[PDB]
Amino acid sequence: FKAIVSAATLRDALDSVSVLVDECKIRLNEESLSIRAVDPANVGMVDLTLDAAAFESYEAHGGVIGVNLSRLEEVAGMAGDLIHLTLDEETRKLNIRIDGLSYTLALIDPDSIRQEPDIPDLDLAANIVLEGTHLDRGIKAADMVSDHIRLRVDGAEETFHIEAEGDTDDVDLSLPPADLISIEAGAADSLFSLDYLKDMNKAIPTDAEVTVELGEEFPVKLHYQIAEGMGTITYMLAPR
Amino acid sequence: FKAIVSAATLRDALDSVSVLVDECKIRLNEESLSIRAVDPANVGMVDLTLDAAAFESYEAHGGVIGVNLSRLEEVAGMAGAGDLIHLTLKLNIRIDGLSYTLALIDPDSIRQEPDIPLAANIVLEGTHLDRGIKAADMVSDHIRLRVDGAEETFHIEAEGDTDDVDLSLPPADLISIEAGAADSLFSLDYLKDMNKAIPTDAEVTVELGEEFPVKLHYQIAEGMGTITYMLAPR
Amino acid sequence: FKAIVSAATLRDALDSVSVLVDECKIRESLSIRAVDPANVGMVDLTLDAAAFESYVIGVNLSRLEEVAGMALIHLTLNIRIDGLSYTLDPDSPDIPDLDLAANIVLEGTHLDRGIKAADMVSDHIRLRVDGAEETFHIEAEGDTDDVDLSLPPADLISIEAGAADSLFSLDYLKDMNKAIPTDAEVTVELGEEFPVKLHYQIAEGMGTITYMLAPR
Ligand code: NA
Ligand code: NA
Ligand code: NA
Ligand code: NA
Ligand code: NA
Ligand code: NA
Ligand code: NA
Ligand code: NA
Ligand code: NA
């Protein structure tokens, strides 16, 4: 495995996974690098695919490696620098080089890291595409009154609602179609742990458009792209 | 009660009160919105007047409501300073597509509102009160405000154990002064926190005496609100 | 005494010493020399008259800093910065001359960078020269991971590449580095299990600071 990737690219990519886990398996496939992981509680799941085209250079033959993702993140943080990634299959180390700086990261046996989850294909009733700013905002407001967040469609009005109910205060971010990028307004109303949804949203880069798949008392999925399109990230969040 | 007001106004308005108390009565008046409070130690008092002309729209009709200030503040915090906040009487607060329902409080459940009841008068640029307060704090938790009449000169000063400090503001560094005898000692932390609430460029009027409370006055909302603080002497 | 000094020049001055001790002795020029409670780190600051617009006491150093942050500072302890008047016993080290085998001149950024990377893996930092390749390394070794900022000639200001490889407390090197201005050129003298010295200038080359740090 050997690759050369832009600093912002890799940091956006590892940021998504690091929201849920501190160690992960990276699949080093011939035409993309991917990571999929579930958290310990089985409440959140992430699926990253970063196409070969996102790299300035990418060469991989199908291996899998196990990494301390918090260390590897800290390292990628030292970098518009390029980050050079080279695996030593012999010593089981990943060399990361950024200019003259060379960091040798000892791999972890993948068999020792949480089994990769299957993110189930769902046919949830509603689909909402919107600017990430709205999800930031609604999550900030909700956090004021509760640690639970409700995502709800008004199917008639084609309006997406991010809301929460506290002991006496309530909040409601109402997003009719003029504040959306698109909506299929099927029946949808689910409640989630706010903190998970907020950490997730925090990894989404600030100008990204987010796709939300939402039903009634089911998990929510969120999809977005990074690397000008050549990477895609999907989160899935179980309802509470 | 129905009012629409700019974010930066309401924030400036609530900040002055928040400095001193966590809840307050807001008197909803026909021509103006007003709050007055005193802290629990009964040492600092604030009096805010928010006139109609500060609200884009403002209709009120004599009521009064009790409010948890921290929360209403955090809510207003959510707007673009440019954004309008819609207030409608629980109090409903809407900002762009965001609506918040804030449960009032029994006004009778709150500390009685004070009324704010001097030889020198000093108008200066808030920036000198910042500096003066910051310097003084390095050396002490008591801060002395003193006029040197002859010299028509305002001093913000403090005496260490080891060290002292003195910010001397003669006429050139003042907006104007009526330099009556005045020399009075205060809790620096009360003055500092009050100061913290004053906007960066506001002009501040200080009334000062000899062993007497100090008052500070300044304007918000480009002129349509007025805030008075009074702080008891030591 | 009486002086009139640039705020930014006097802050960079006092910073280099403040980093090592909370209190100190001030003495053609101004100077301070102190070594830290553990006798491990030392500083020798020298400010030339020309660093001063106009130009032995024993100062409380963290307070002088706090006052200088209110800012030309007039020094007459009595301090004045515009309208601001602040009123604030020396009996209350030998930096050896070494001919350390190596001498490296480099941009400050590099040393920042090497220390930040080393810190992710250890609280010990290694400074090493590769004589052959005239390449300065800043490196660390962890429980399982390693880092090496390798700085060949192309990435240096100068190098006299003697044999040298010494190990140090990263926290003290990191504190020292804190006070060094962001675009300073730093000269390092280095040998084989010996103290390191760092030299840099302030006040436009009007001021010179030396640090020395004992090895581990
Ligand atoms: Na669907
Ligand atoms: Na919360
Ligand atoms: Na919480
Ligand atoms: Na008067
Ligand atoms: Na103080
Ligand atoms: Na204090
Ligand atoms: Na030498
Ligand atoms: Na460390
Ligand atoms: Na450490």
- Where residue C187 falls (left for φ over 0; alpha for ψ -120 to 50; beta otherwise) is beta
| C174 alpha carbon – ligand 9 mean position (Å) | 11
Q: Which amino acid is at B225?
A: G
Q: What tokens does A156 get? A: 């008639």
Q: Which domain holds residue A38?
A: 1-240
| C168 alpha carbon – ligand 9 mean position (Å) | 13
What's the domain count of chain B? 1
Domain at B78, CATH number:
3.70.10.10
* Minimal Cβ distance to C150: which of A78, A102, A104: A102
**Cβ-defined contacts of C48-54 (< 8 Å, 24+):** C48/C203, C48/C206, C48/C207, C50/C206, C51/C5, C51/C6, C51/C9, C51/C202, C51/C203, C51/C204, C51/C206, C51/C207, C52/C3, C52/C4, C52/C5, C52/C6, C53/C4, C53/C5, C53/C6, C54/C2, C54/C3, C54/C4
Taking Cα atoms as reference points, which of A58, A32, A62, A60 lies closest to residue A47?
Answer: A32
- Where residue A205 falls (left for φ over 0; alpha for ψ -120 to 50; beta otherwise) is beta
Task: State the Cα–Cα distance between residues C205 and A172, nearest whole angstrom.
Answer: 61
Residue C183 dihedral angles phi and psi, to the nearest 5°: -115, 10
Tell me if chain C has a CB within 8 Å of the CB of B162. yes
B71 neighbourhood in chain A, CB within 8 Å? 144, 169
State whether B78 and A137 contact (CB < 8 Å): yes
* Three-class DSSP category at C139: strand
How many helices, marked H, and strands, marked E, lie in chain A?
A: 4, 18
DSSP bridge partners of C130: C135
Burial readout C47-85 (b: 16 or more C-beta within 10 A, e: otherwise):
bbeebbeebeeebebebbbbbbebbbbbbebebbbebbb
Pairing state between β C102-107 and B84-88: unpaired
Measured in whole angstroms, how far is the alpha carbon of residue C116 from the centre of its chain?
Answer: 17
Half-sphere exposure of B72 (CA within 13 A, CB side): 29
B77 neighbourhood in chain A, CB within 8 Å? none
Task: State the Cα–Cα distance between residues C14 and C41, nearest whole angstrom.
Answer: 16
Q: What tokens does A235 get? A: 């989160």
Q: Are A42 and A118 in contact (CB under 8 A)?
A: no
Q: Are A185 and A155 in contact (CB under 8 A)?
A: yes
How many other CB atoms are found less than 10 A from the CB of residue B223? 10
| Residue corresponding to tokens 């103290």 | C195
How many other CB atoms are found less than 10 A from the CB of residue A121? 6
Cα-Cα end-to-end distance for chain B = 41
| Touching chains, B (3+ CB pairs < 8 A) | A, C
What DSSP letter does each residue of A8-43 carry, written as one string? HHHHHHHHHHHTT-SEEEEEE-SSEEEEEEE-TTSS
* Minimal Cβ distance to B100: which of A137, A141, A179: A141
DSSP bridge partners of B215: B207, B230
Task: State the Cα–Cα distance between residues B49 and B9, nearest whole angstrom.
Answer: 12
* Three-class DSSP category at B224: coil
* Three-class DSSP category at C170: helix
Q: Are A57 and A64 in contact (CB under 8 A)?
A: no
Which residues contact residue B50 at a Cβ distance below 8 angstroms, ignoring those fewer than 6 apart? B9, B13, B32, B33, B34, B221, B224, B225
| B121 alpha carbon – ligand 4 mean position (Å) | 6
Tell me if chain C has a CB within 8 Å of the CB of A75. yes
State whether B162 and C67 contact (CB < 8 Å): no
Alpha carbon dihedral A50, A52, A55, A56, in 10-degree steps, equals -170
**Cβ-defined contacts of A35-43 (< 8 Å, 24+):** A36/A116, A36/A117, A36/A119, A37/A114, A37/A116, A37/A117, A38/A114, A38/A116, A38/A117, A40/A114, A42/A238, A43/A193, A43/A196, A43/A237, A43/A238
Q: Are B25 and B64 in contact (CB under 8 A)?
A: yes
B78 neighbourhood in chain A, CB within 8 Å? 137, 140-141
Name the closest residue on chain C to residue B161, using Cα atoms. C88
DSSP state of A218: S
Q: B16: part of which helix (H) or strand (E)? A: helix B7-18
Q: To the nearest whole angstrom, how far is the Cα of B133 from the nearest Cα of chain A?
A: 33
- Among B67, B68, B93, B100, pick the best mutation site for testing chain A contact (most A Cβ within 10 A): B100
| Residue corresponding to tokens 């008392």 | A217
